[PDB]
Amino acid sequence: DAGHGQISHKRHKTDSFVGLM
Q: Indicate the DSSP class of residue 1.
A: -
Alpha-helix residue ranges (DSSP H) falling in 1-21: 13-18
What are the C-alpha distances in Å from 15 to residues 1, 5, 7, 9, 19? Answer: 24, 16, 15, 10, 7
Technique behind the model = NMR
Return d(Cα 12, Cα 16) in angstroms, integer: 7
